[PDB]
Write a protein that binds this DNA or RNA. Structure first.
Lengths: 467, 212, 299, 199
DNA sequence: TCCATGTTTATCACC
């Protein structure tokens, strides 16, 4: 028969509901770009037509054969062999349209997406029951499965009816942490939630250890809130096709982030660059209203959540990405000021007090120089070039009167007193000689030195660079 | 007609169906506001029943009123991870099936979060009898409310208003609920709300009429 | 026809409570961004547990015990709480089961699903946190024992601080007149608070009440916000004593008696007469709670 | 039935608890921030170890001792020869694993966890200190004999201070099982506390 | 209404 459905984005309560619409639209378009789909249309009279495509509404018409073809494309899986480092094979889904757009080296981005799909969303064996059975089928051989399609088609007849949710989708409508009461939903909404994962972006976080190893754990999921359905489906084909191909071990360079906010903000940077490349699109807000950030991790038979956030995508953070690329490359603890920027938080980066937590951890392990000598100088005060000239003159005078491994001695000498300066959280003696070695700025010395905090920790840093 | 201010040092407004990990919203939901207003009125809930569900509230008779919400200063939030009272979701067995006296026996901690400070200027348009009943309750014979005093005319602040599909919002709340009973129903349609920062009185669109 | 509520304070001493969720090799404590600083927080649950432990310690019967189970901690030794007497100390007879009381006709009583008495807030510190550290050794249990040795011995860190803890009380309910003896025993147990946080035996901290002072008219909570106190120097004065002086006839000082046991040390007389003629006695908090309970149960 | 607790202090003298883990050129002891000043700290673990050692001294049955014959810190008698039938102060020590003497259920019916009857707290100073005070020096090497071979020729200094300090302690009264001769020995040993330091 | 299972990948960018 013929079944017609209509949908609107003004009534969906969840962002994933909106994402699933774009996902299924992309799946239908991918179907329309395959010769075997046209062969199936010619033979079995497959019906799948998008009627209305506008800013808000959407329409679709389909038959049983079209639904079967869509299920075959979406739930296609294959078998992969893995060796321990006694052989074992792992069933992995094909990925749908993702294979049609991934041209990166080895499809390493596809590998990350596939791992998360089986690992968290599909932790329940349900993916495996459906996925393993599906695996190894040949589309060119006419292989198909319809046992599960019949139940869905019968359920889809009463789209207004209700049915319970499951852990495969967003979780919570189970026990509910209070009272043995189920949830409220309608059937056709649940069906749309079968394709929201494809649109989602995946990032891999990690935790620093004492040795500095990138201990990857869990995943970071980014969910966009689509405003204009018509415009959204056009930019993405080039956004996902222009990803950086840089590889670092088993992961891409961009796949490694520290805080969850890094992944969401990085997506905004990528889209606007493609907006500058793909004409017909203006501001970010005209395409995305909100961004969802999810941190998840699987341990044993249970999945543990850490943080759920959704806040105000903006366009004033473009310079931040460039500010950290040229700054975070050398050290590993500069991420703290990156977290600082993300009523009294507008220009808080001027102070940027990233000295407290950063210094305590790196005390024992990461102690093993002048790279970070000036870093603590600004924190001590909470004026600089004058002390540099004072120190230079003292050493020059000392050698004048007396008239390749000094770098290693230089590093050790300052470390002996930088460490003791950390613990202070005599100081007027060495400067007393240096001044003696040497006037409005001279008047300002009295007012900038008599403070106890300045006496305790400020004046005893810059002079150490001399000897 | 007349409106009033309130403040409190700590607060928590958990969205429903949160699941394992709990969350909160910067602004209390409309239903919680209505519950607070009913509690301060001294009138008990229409339902006196006990069982699996205890929110059987037909809308046949209930005083009518219009509610607006203000917000004077943004507030941050913190999280605490101590313990939670788990509801069994697995076949389980053993000890839980032995005693069974309001058991809730399985315990597993995950997370939750709370606010740091709250101070709101709530707006109400209500008949005179309800206002008089509130006056009698406040003056007469869970760390949520600290003190209340009506300073309506001064102390201006920002307000909230539903947004139509145009432009873009800023610092907007995620979800909001108008009326709900914890059984099979349609919940509420309008979800997205956004604030506007301006000094004078909120516009006519800001006021929302509750069906209850 | 009034619901009096109080506010307590504790003597300074090093902190003991650890809040778990240990990161790397240190066990941390939750903090709140009150004014961009760090503070110590004790959840109300542990205090409720300590109160229940004290009630079971003083001989009051109850039907709930959490024992040291071999596998993992659990709460048991309970039955049907059909009578609120001898069960649940008139507080929180929670139940969610559907097969309850044979579907409730045999009970003929309220299931006590949400009857809440003695609502309480959560304690906050008075001083910031300055990143202290104390070392930790934990040597391997043995090199030859049958019992395992964790395969290694590792040294770790801790952090502690010395801080008081102000605390609002928020006692309410004019219906708690059925068992005045139970109310008096509960108030005495609160006056005898000790070992409230189940932190650990060594480096123990105790809540010694001191300058426990707050009263109000038969209205709802207002007035002094139950917070805003200095670092143990002089706390109630700048909070509300100036307002009481300016409102000696506006806010009722006859029922809102004086504040701070420190009045026993400085400015005793001036606070004695020129403040008010109410029962401003402060010698021991025990007798203060006793006669306050007597007055509250009187009407 | 009769709880008790006390606070004790001692005579002034130079400090002893020298942690000395800061760096190669310094020996920094633990400090606490009290009212804007710095005060000395001695952790309760040192006092627990000293009490255990004195219970060893007085010819009291024991279930734990050190060996001092291993590369790193190790304790042997704690877990090797003991079924945890009766600890020193009835501590009845514990450790978590998949199994522990068949989960110590069948052979010896005891709770998996412990008791912790005794209570104690941190020891804090009474007056602050003023930075580094004392100097030091180290020899070059073993010289003619080639057995040390440190090749250091180092020259360092440590930190000392003069302060008397006090600490409290407590003890419950309802615990009266096997009390008459066990706990009184501990209370008598409270009077000595000679070797409780880090050097 | 009540019977069932699962994991497998090592490491890198500064003066």
């Amino acid at each position: 028969e013929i079944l017609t459905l209509d949908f609107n984005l003004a009534e969906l309560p969840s962002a994933q509901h909106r994402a699933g619409l774009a996902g299924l639209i992309l799946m239908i378009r991918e179907l329309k770009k395959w010769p075997w789909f046209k062969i199936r249309q010619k033979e079995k009279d497959v019906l799948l037509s998008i009627e209305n495509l506008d800013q808000y509404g959407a329409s679709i018409q389909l038959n049983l054969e079209g639904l079967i073809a869509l299920f075959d494309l979406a739930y296609l899986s294959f078998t992969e062999e893995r060796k321990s480092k006694y052989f074992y094979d792992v069933i992995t889904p094909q990925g749908g349209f993702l294979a049609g757009w991934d041209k990166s080296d080895g499809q390493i981005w596809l590998r990350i997406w596939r791992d998360m799909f089986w690992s968290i969303i599909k932790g329940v064996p349900a993916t495996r029951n459906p996925f393993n059975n599906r695996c190894g089928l040949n589309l060119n051989a006419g292989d198909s499965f319809s046992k599960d399609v019949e139940s869905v088609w019968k359920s889809l007849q009463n789209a207004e009816k209700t049915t319970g949710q499951s852990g495969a989708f967003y979780l919570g409508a189970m026990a509910v942490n209070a009272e043995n009461v189920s949830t409220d939903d309608l059937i056709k909404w649940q069906f749309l939630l079968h394709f929201w994962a494809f649109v989602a972006q995946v990032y891999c976080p990690y935790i620093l250890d004492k040795d500095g190893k990138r201990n990857f754990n869990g995943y970071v999921i980014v969910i966009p809130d689509i405003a204009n359905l018509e415009d959204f489906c056009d930019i993405l084909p080039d956004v996902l096709s222009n990803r950086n191909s840089k590889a670092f071990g088993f992961r891409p360079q961009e796949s490694v982030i520290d805080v969850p906010e890094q992944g969401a903000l990085e997506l905004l940077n990528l889209i606007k660059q493609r907006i500058a490349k793909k004409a017909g699109s203006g501001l970010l807000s005209d395409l995305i209203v909100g961004v969802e950030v999810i941190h998840a991790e699987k341990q044993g038979n249970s999945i543990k959540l850490h943080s759920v956030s959704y806040l105000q995508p903006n366009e004033e953070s473009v310079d931040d990405y460039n500010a950290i690329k040229n700054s975070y490359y050398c050290p590993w603890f500069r991420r703290q000021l990156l977290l600082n920027l993300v009523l009294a938080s507008q220009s808080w980066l001027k102070r940027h007090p990233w000295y407290g937590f950063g210094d305590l951890l790196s005390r024992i392990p990461q102690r093993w120089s002048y790279f970070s000598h000036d870093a603590r100088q600004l924190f001590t005060q909470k004026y600089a070039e004058i002390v540099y000239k004072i120190a230079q003159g003292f050493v020059l005078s000392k050698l004048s009167s007396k008239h390749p491994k000094l770098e290693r001695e230089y590093n050790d000498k300052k470390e002996k007193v930088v460490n003791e300066a950390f613990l202070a959280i005599e100081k007027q003696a060495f400067i007393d000689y240096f001044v003696s070695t040497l006037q409005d700025e001279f008047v300002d010395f009295a007012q900038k030195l008599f403070q106890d905090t300045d006496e305790i920790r400020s004046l005893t840093l810059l002079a150490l660079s001399s000897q | 007609t007349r409106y009033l201010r309130l403040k409190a040092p700590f607060a928590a407004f958990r969205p429903f169906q949160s699941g394992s990990f709990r969350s909160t919203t910067p602004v209390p939901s409309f239903s919680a506001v209505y519950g607070l207003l009913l509690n301060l009125a001294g009138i008990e809930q229409r339902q006196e029943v006990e069982g699996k569900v205890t929110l059987i509230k037909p809308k046949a008779e209930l005083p009518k009123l219009a509610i607006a919400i203000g917000q004077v200063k943004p507030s941050s939030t913190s999280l605490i991870n101590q313990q939670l009272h788990n509801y069994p979701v697995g076949n389980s067995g053993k000890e839980f099936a032995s005693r069974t006296f309001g058991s809730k026996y399985w315990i597993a901690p995950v997370r939750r979060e709370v606010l740091v400070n709250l101070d709101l200027i709530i707006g109400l348009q209500s008949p005179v009898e309800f206002w008089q009943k509130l006056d009698q309750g406040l003056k007469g014979e869970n760390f949520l409310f600290d003190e209340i005093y009506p300073i309506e005319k001064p102390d201006l602040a920002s307000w909230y208003c539903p947004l139509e599909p145009d432009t873009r919002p800023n610092q907007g709340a995620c979800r909001l609920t108008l009326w709900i009973d914890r059984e099979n129903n349609t919940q509420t349609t309008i979800k997205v709300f956004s604030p506007s920062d301006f000094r004078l009185e909120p516009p006519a669109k800001a006021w929302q009429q509750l069906p209850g | 026809n009034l619901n009096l509520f109080a506010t307590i304070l504790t003597y300074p001493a090093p902190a003991s409570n650890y809040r778990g969720e240990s990161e790397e090799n240190r066990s941390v404590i939750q903090k709140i961004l009150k004014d961009g600083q760090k503070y110590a927080i004790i959840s109300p649950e542990s205090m409720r547990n300590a109160l229940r432990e004290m009630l079971i310690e003083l001989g009051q019967p109850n039907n709930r015990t959490r024992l040291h189970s071999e596998d993992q901690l659990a709460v048991e030794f309970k039955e049907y709480p059909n009578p609120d007497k001898f069960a649940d100390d008139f507080l929180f007879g929670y139940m969610v089961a559907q097969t309850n009381d044979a579907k409730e006709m045999k009970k003929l009583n309220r299931p006590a699903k949400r009857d809440s008495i003695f609502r309480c807030n959560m304690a906050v510190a008075v001083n910031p946190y300055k990143y202290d550290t104390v070392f930790y050794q934990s040597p391997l249990n043995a090199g030859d024992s049958a019992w395992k040795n964790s395969t290694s011995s590792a040294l770790l860190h801790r952090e502690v601080t010395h801080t008081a803890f102000q605390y609002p009380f928020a006692l309410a309910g004019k219906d708690c007149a059925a068992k005045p003896e139970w109310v008096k025993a509960l108030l005495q147990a609160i006056a005898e608070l000790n070992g409230v946080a189940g932190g650990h035996a060594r480096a123990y901290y105790e809540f010694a009440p001191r300058s426990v002072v707050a009263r109000l008219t038969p209205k709802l909570v207002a007035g002094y916000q139950t917070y805003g106190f200095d670092a143990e120097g002089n706390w109630l004065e700048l909070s509300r004593l100036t307002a009481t002086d300016s409102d000696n006839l506006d806010l009722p000082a006859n029922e809102f008696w004086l504040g701070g046991e420190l009045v026993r040390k400085m400015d005793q007389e001036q606070k004695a007469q020129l403040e008010a003629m109410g029962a401003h006695l402060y010698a021991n908090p025990e007798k203060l709670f006793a006669d306050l309970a007597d007055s509250f149960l009187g009407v």
